[PDB]
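Continuing from yesterday's entry. The apo prediction looked reasonable, so today I'm repeating it with 1-[(4S)-2,5-dioxoimidazolidin-4-yl]urea included to see how the binding region is handled. Same sequence as before; SMILES copied from the compound registry.
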Amino acid sequence: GEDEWKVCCGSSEFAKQMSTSGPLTSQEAIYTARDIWFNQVNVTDWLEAFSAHPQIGNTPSEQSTAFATTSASALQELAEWNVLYKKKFGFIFIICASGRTHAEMLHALKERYENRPIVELEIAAMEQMKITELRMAKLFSD
Amino acid sequence: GEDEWKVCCGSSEFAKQMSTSGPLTSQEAIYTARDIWFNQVNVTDWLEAFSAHPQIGNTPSEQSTAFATTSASALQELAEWNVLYKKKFGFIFIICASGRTHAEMLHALKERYENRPIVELEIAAMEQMKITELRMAKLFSD
Ligand SMILES: NC(=O)N[C@H]1NC(=O)NC1=O
Ligand SMILES: NC(=O)N[C@H]1NC(=O)NC1=O
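Holo prediction written out below.
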């Protein structure tokens, strides 16, 4: 539909496989995206896509709500735990931000820090997919 | 016990964390290895460790049985499907070889080819751990 998918998912492979898809509605596009993401792209592609995002607490818009409500204290712990999380899991903390505060997200990060690396990899994959779905609606609603 | 663990697991992190472990029996060492492998090292470390191995059908000893029973035909499909598997999953096909034939392993590879990349990542992690356990016994039995 438009290889501007590298923006709608930092995964080159996902963008590629989507670029060559027989155009469909805004609904079928969602379903075809999830199947490719969850069953076709490999772990390496998931990692590329995660890296494309700014950490939670930095800027590069899903974070508008969090910034319209942030605090130096939240931005502080955040900048610190992001470092801790990257060291432990190998990729940055991924979460679909939106109506979320930096405080709630800092808490979700601390919480998730205690997961096994393999499980954090599944949760991030899911959070990434939600972000992608969110951005696809923005392309089809327009 | 001896940072020669990079040989007993291509993971630098796993080797590191093990190098600084209060010496224990051949049994406690196994259990401490599994916990570190499954709950401490990240996906990136799993990937480093997989890469350290020769593909099934190539040489760099767990493969002695398979070579004492191989065939040009098995070595052929193998060399081909290994390429296909790497393309799809992002890492080579990992399996504890031993009393296994290239034929049985070629079949396990074709079978596993139909798994979701995330699941192949778990199976490889487990196969890798079995290989590691196998090699640790060889260090403590000596
Ligand atoms: N850190 C992190 O997950 N950032 C991503 N999440 C989101 O909603 N937008 C992003 O860029
Ligand atoms: N391909 C692959 O898993 N090779 C590994 N397995 C094993 O038993 N020894 C290896 O080096």
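Comparison notes:
- Chain B has one domain: 1-142.
- Chain B is about 60% helix and 0% strand.
Will overlay with the apo model tomorrow.
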